[PDB]
């Protein structure tokens, strides 16, 4: 009977058009029946779900919907499983004073312009906490051939990351303008957009 607690996806706490949620997860556990009580900020809630179950892996999961900006506000989420005695575990957004991310866009190395497709990169340094969303887009529509590294702890005690978008060099060299969009709590409107072109 091992229990874990996993925070919502940053894409969901910052886009709001999506419903975030905190995922409680219990493994190990014959007796595959576990009651789940939930508490937000010390007070019990009952709106949580439970998905059908799954070595003989007891992957039974309860997901709980985040209300509005409860995550960023700093609400604390507690999951309580029962058969042992009840095992409680808590999860909350990283404490510390927020810092606004710097977003810089960085065009492909000249030495890469020998290959069928080039790499466009977005550097986002010095934000806090690490909860952050990054996406790409071209002339009104969004791109989708991009990967974003995870937050990395920096010398100054904040985070950075990079997103690499990959496009056909025919599309870079034509002068098309791509946009890196970034969503974090320390940004006005939770939002900034950086562009780069030839």
Partner 1 sequence: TPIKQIFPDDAFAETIKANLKVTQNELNSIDQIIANNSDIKSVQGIQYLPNVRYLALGGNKLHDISALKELTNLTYLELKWNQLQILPNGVFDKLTNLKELVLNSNQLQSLPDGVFDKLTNLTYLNLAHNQLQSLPDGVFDKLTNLTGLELCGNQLQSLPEGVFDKLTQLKDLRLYQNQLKSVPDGVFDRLTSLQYIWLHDNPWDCTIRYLSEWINKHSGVVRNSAGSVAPDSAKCSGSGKPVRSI
Ligand X SMILES: *[C@@H]1O[C@H](CO[C@@H]2O[C@@H](C)[C@@H](O)[C@@H](O)[C@@H]2O)[C@@H](O[C@@H]2O[C@H](CO)[C@@H](O[C@@H]3O[C@H](CO[C@H]4O[C@H](CO)[C@@H](O)[C@H](O)[C@@H]4O[C@@H]4O[C@H](CO)[C@@H](O)[C@H](O)[C@H]4NC(C)=O)[C@@H](O)[C@H](O[C@H]4O[C@H](CO)[C@@H](O)[C@H](O)[C@@H]4O[C@@H]4O[C@H](CO)[C@@H](O)[C@H](O)[C@H]4NC(C)=O)[C@@H]3O)[C@H](O)[C@H]2NC(C)=O)[C@H](O)[C@H]1NC(C)=O
Q: Which residues 6+ apart lie within 8 Å of 188 measured at CB?
A: none
Say if CB 77 and CB 38 are below 8 A apart: yes
* Pick 75 or 171: Cβ nearer ligand X: 75
Nearest partner of 103 among 81, 134, 129, judged by Cα:
134
* Residue 192 interacting with a second copy (CB under 8 A): no
174 contacts which partner out of partner 1, ligand X, a second copy, none, CB within 5 to 8 A by kind? Answer: none
Breaks (C-N over 2.5 A) in the chain follow: 29, 54, 83
100-139 burial: b if 16+ Cβ within 10 Å, else e = ebebebebbeeeeeeeeebbbbbbbbebbbbbbbbbbbee
By CB under 8 A, residue 188 contacts a second copy: no
**Total of residues contacting a second copy (CB under 8 A):** 29
Only segment of 23-31, 65-73, 147-155, 180-188 that touches partner 1 (CB under 8 A): 65-73
Could you give phi then psi for residue 72, rounded to 5 degrees?
Answer: -65, -35
If binding means CB under 6 A, how many residues of this protein chain bind ligand X?
10
The nearer residue to a second copy, 44 or 112, going by C-beta atoms, is 112
Site string for ligand X, 11-40 (x = CB under 6 A): ------------x-x-xx------------
Applying CB under 8 A, which of residues 147, 175, 188, 189 lies at the interface with a second copy?
147
By the rule CB under 6 A, 6 interacts with ligand X:
yes
Q: Which residues contact 197 (CB under 8 A, 6 or more apart)?
A: 175, 176, 177, 178
Q: Applying CB under 8 A, which residues contact a second copy?
A: 102, 104-109, 111-112, 115, 119, 121, 123, 125, 145, 147-150, 152-155, 160-162, 164, 166, 194
């Amino acid at each position: 009977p091992s229990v874990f607690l996993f925070p919502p996806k940053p894409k969901d706490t910052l886009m709001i058009s999506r419903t975030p949620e905190v995922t409680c997860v219990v493994v190990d556990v014959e007796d595959p029946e576990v009651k789940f009580n939930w508490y937000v900020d010390g007070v019990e809630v009952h709106n949580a779900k439970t998905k059908p179950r799954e070595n003989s892996t007891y992957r039974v999961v309860s997901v709980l919907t985040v209300l509005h900006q409860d995550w960023l506000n700093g609400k604390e989420y507690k999951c309580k499983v029962s058969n042992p005695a009840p095992i409680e575990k808590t999860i909350s957004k990283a404490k510390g004073q927020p810092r606004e991310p710097q977003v810089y866009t960085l065009p492909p190395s000249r030495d890469e312009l020998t290959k069928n497709q080039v790499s466009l990169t977005c550097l986002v340094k010095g934000f806090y906490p690490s909860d952050i969303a990054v996406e790409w887009e071209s002339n009104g529509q969004p791109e989708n051939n991009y990967k974003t590294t995870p937050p990395v702890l920096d010398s100054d005690g904040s985070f950075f990351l990079y997103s690499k978008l990959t496009v056909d060099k025919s599309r870079w060299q034509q002068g098309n303008v791509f946009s890196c969009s970034v969503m974090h709590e320390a940004l006005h409107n939770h939002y900034t957009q950086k562009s780069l072109s030839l």
